[PDB]
Amino acid sequence: SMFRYSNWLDKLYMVVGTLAAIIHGAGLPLMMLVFGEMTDIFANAGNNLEEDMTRYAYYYSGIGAGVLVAAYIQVSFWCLAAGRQIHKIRKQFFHAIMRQEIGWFDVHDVGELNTRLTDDVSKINEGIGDKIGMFFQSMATFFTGFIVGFTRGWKLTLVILAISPVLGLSAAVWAKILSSFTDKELLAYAKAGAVAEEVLAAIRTVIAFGGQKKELERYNKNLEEAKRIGIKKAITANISIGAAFLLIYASYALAFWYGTTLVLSGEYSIGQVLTVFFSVLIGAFSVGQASPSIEAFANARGAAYEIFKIIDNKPSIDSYSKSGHKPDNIKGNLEFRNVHFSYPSRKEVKILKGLNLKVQSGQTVALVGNSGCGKSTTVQLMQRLYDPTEGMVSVDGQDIRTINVRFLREIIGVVSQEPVLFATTIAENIRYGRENVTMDEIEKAVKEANAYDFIMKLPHKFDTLVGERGAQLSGGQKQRIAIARALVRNPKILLLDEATSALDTESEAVVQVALDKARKGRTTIVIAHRLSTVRNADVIAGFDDGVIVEKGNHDELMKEKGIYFKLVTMQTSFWRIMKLNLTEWPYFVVGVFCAIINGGLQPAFAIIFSKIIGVFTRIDDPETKRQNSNLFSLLFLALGIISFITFFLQGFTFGKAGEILTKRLRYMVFRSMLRQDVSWFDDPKNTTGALTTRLANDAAQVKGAIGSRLAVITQNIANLGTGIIISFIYGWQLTLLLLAIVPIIAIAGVVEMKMLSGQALKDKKELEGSGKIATEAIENFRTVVSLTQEQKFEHMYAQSLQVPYRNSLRKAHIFGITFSFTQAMMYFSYAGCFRFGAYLVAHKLMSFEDVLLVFSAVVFGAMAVGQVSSFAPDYAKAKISAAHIIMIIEKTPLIDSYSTEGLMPNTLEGNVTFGEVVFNYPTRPDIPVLQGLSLEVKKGQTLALVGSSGCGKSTVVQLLERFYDPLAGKVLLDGKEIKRLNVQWLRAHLGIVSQEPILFDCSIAENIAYGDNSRVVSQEEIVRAAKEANIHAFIESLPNKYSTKVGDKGTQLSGGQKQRIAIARALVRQPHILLLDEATSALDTESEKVVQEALDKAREGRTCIVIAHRLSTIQNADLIVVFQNGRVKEHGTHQQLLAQKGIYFSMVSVQ
């Protein structure tokens, strides 16, 4: 039940604030009783009073000042306590996440963890900021009203109490519905948001395969579900509002039943009865307004329990534990015996079944194994990402548990086969790798990393920008950057995986030699697949089924007739904003008629009540006037019923219009994004997170800017006009004070509601950066844990959140001050109006009834306008967001992907002709990669591409897929211009596989079927693809078969498995022309020959392009082309290339 246990001074401050709120709530019935007594005194006088009026005004002013001071103090204390608690909870959660083990992170989805940390924290802040204080004040006011009624009212008090519970329940329901709107909207739209985020994550592959139809259908279904949920919520809110409105009419009808009882009633005059009724109404309103705190108490308790459970997950392996010891004389020595471990996703499968391995300091040790032999698993185990199920792994003869992952990973840096990076500058990545580099270690790593051409020629050598996940950077460039970053860290246990054997082997000799420069000062384990690299390795160890079989020098392995020998032998405005008229044309007017009706509801009742007040005055008029009072009460009840009906109708119409507009806008935005140039997405402005936030936080802004804005404006204008007309007609002198106080009162009312939406929006805007940092740390938590950078990340997050904490505290203080000022202004205005009415009554300028009616009408109009403005959103920054949205819809891309204009060829001959083709990237158009190269390819021809890293082969392949356009030259397919052909049709027929393909985090079968878009992918196609790629056996070996779930970035499979899956999907796509980038890679080279050779069987009848460092794969190619700085030095048969002493000949000789 209790969740607060820190900052006992904070608890005392909260208690003081609650006491002040209760005092104000109790005083409110005191003000009601004072008003009733003043009314009774005026009625008695009408049947000297200046001194009494002045004394009452002074007492009211003092009471209002005290109430305002107490309310301000309570609000400020509650806001400060809520902010401090939120900050402390966020810090504790960050610390727990940093201390959280790798297993916990693997078990719980990182995206789900971030979503929880955001949503639960926001809900706790919303439900603990002002809800408790408001509930306490409402309860105190209700108790004071009940106490006052018990001693004053007798039968009237009993009737008021009996009628109270229905109105209290209605107000409670209305408050609960109004308070928790985000929980209903964002929760429903979370599915659509996640779908959009997933689509944006692999938009590149989606455009490559043209699978926009499925994404559009899913988005449409999610939008329809969200619209249905919103319509239901709006209907419920309208019903609650109608019930609340009818409650006032019912209460008025019940009160009017007195009649013959006269003002005397039991023992008091009409003033006492009116005061009792007002106190009962105030108590019922407070009870209704105290409900939301209790209603959200359950959600707050659930969020607090979840946060505590996450924080209270103290694991055995703690990064902040002081029980361990930090090793200093860490000599290079590793020993693993009977090492057995199983992944958590598939516990049944045991990749490692024990083995004996020993590595000495300053010794280059390489591991060679079959497909999925456990090389990546062994590297991960060495990095301490997981734990050993059985066996014993020690470093320097000491158990790993002695120094924990803390001292294990913090001293050894490793690079994965496909290292991840951040969309920032290269210098930023270097600094992230090591903060204390001082520009010396970075320079040394750059010199050793052999990365000069890319850094030098490209602009901003130390500030060169890289897209998401280093998309702009080349695969070889990315590998070189990762190697340099690892070297800069100055690690003692180097871990090399797929250094440069990705695209061309020519760079491999340049890279491996560099690795030989510094390979004796510390232990180094590398995963080599080339013959030269394997031979250069000091020691090579053979693994099979997770068991070490061979271990020794290259000569020993060759003479042992082991797996290495077999592998070697095998190798050999309104117009732009009011766009709802298409669907809202026959409904908006229906709402408008309601809005005007609402404008008439506020003043009309103000008059009717006034007509009652005068009827209740002058000794309740004569006996004949009783029928007039009854008629006035009946008219007021009818007007209230009509107003409730009109409000319900207007709310339903507004909700329907808003839902329709939001759905249409979302559909248009999705269509525009799908039919957009690929180059547009490759820019810092089109960030995945920023784009998702803009897309999600658009419906509410547009709705509030158009529909709610118009409704509020119309209602306020109508109310103000009606009030002014009534005051002028029935007011001569008192109208001046009402007009003077109108603007301040209206502003206070507009800023009189909860206004939590603005505070939440400001907090989200401030903490967007902190959330992005947290997401980056969680997604790449493995990299941070490897370098033991948890403390630095936590410090950075705290520093970034500190400013938002101060801004939120200042905003809360400002809001509390504004609320206190509004309350004090209302209290003083009441006394001023009473004094003005008394002064007017003293003279013959106007009667008491007219002045009272004018004052009541003015006050009611101002309060209604303020409440409508505060509750209903109005002009704000949302309009600006609309400018960012509409321009997106109206924007047209350079290439009309959606447009069907395109020549339809009779048949596909699989012929490509490029001549003098020159292309330049959009981000860096001053550094072109092509100088007018040419290439001819015929049907059923196998072409291989080689050359220096980043020579343009990948760029040429991308251009072939119509990803971009050439600055100059000519590109034709089967003697036909590519630009004059369908883009989607051409892409669907192109089997393009990138160096780092993206696999959706879903079932393997679903991912495979997604390759063949616009057609049904039966299980037979998947089986055939697996057989072609030899993946059926692997799928059967793994649990769930094709139903196995895929985690983030394919966490359930290795790089080789992902490459095989991508190849199988491309084959299933039935591509007339196929292209692969870094298809071979390490990927268990021995297994690759099994798959690659199979491709040769399927290569018949189609043109295939393969780029890889291995010479064996290129040998089978019909033609081989070498590109040097975008220029094809030579092209022809393998024998011709071998005869010529070119780049290819030199590479072959080196290998």
Ligand SMILES: COc1ccc(CCN(C)CCC[C@](C#N)(c2ccc(OC)c(OC)c2)C(C)C)cc1OC
């Ligand atoms: C509708 O019938 C009426 C009932 C009471 C009163 C005035 C009674 N006086 C003691 C002043 C109290 C002001 C009052 C309270 N409590 C109040 C004012 C502003 C508020 O913030 C929006 C509020 O909410 C807590 C309550 C309510 C009557 C509106 C006027 C009325 O006519 C408008």
Ligand SMILES: Nc1ncnc2c1ncn2[C@@H]1O[C@H](COP(=O)(O)OP(=O)(O)OP(=O)(O)O)[C@@H](O)[C@H]1O
């Ligand atoms: N997190 C995981 N959950 C389940 N299975 C996994 C996970 N990581 C890897 N695997 C699978 O377990 C086996 C581990 O193979 P490992 O990656 O260690 O060897 P490898 O020869 O270096 O791999 P590759 O050439 O595919 O990169 C492979 O089948 C891999 O698909």
Ligand SMILES: Nc1ncnc2c1ncn2[C@@H]1O[C@H](COP(=O)(O)OP(=O)(O)OP(=O)(O)O)[C@@H](O)[C@H]1O
């Ligand atoms: N979107 C991009 N914006 C700017 N420069 C880019 C972009 N994509 C690639 N580059 C640059 O173009 C060159 C990439 O060359 P290319 O795409 O032809 O690859 P490659 O030589 O086949 O091999 P790899 O797979 O290693 O990139 C590198 O200079 C890279 O920095």
Ligand SMILES: [Mg+2]
């Ligand atoms: Mg591997």
Ligand SMILES: [Mg+2]
């Ligand atoms: Mg490439």
